[PDB]
Amino acid sequence: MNAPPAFESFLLFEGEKKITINKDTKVPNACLFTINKEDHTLGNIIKSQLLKDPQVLFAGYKVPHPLEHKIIIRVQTTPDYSPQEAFTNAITDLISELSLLEERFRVAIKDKQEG
């Protein structure tokens, strides 16, 4: 009766924004990113990539409730560097790694079959 439809976990409805940017006023150079209709599949990669950056002092994510689909990411970086730049660089590096991985897997398939 009160069952939400299955597509509500990945479909943005009328009005919902994918990502909203808010600042953190407790500590300087901190920022919070709220992502709607996402889960650990993206949160974990983005966090682990942010931690590789030597100019990132804090990088975490959490899902506030398992029944409500929303991801919150918090990143604080050293001065003369902004968390938005850290986030964008992280996404770019992830895309580059995935593209290289796909290329190498395709060549490995080609070597394995008929070779």
């Binding site: 924004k17 994918k18 940017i21 990669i45 992830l94 895309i95 995935l98």
Partner: peptide
């Protein structure tokens, strides 16, 4: 499929910034 999820996130972040 994972690569397209990250790309769409980058597009939305760029608009918001």
């Amino acid at each position: 499929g994972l690569k397209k999820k990250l790309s769409d996130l980058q597009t939305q972040l760029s608009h918001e910034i």
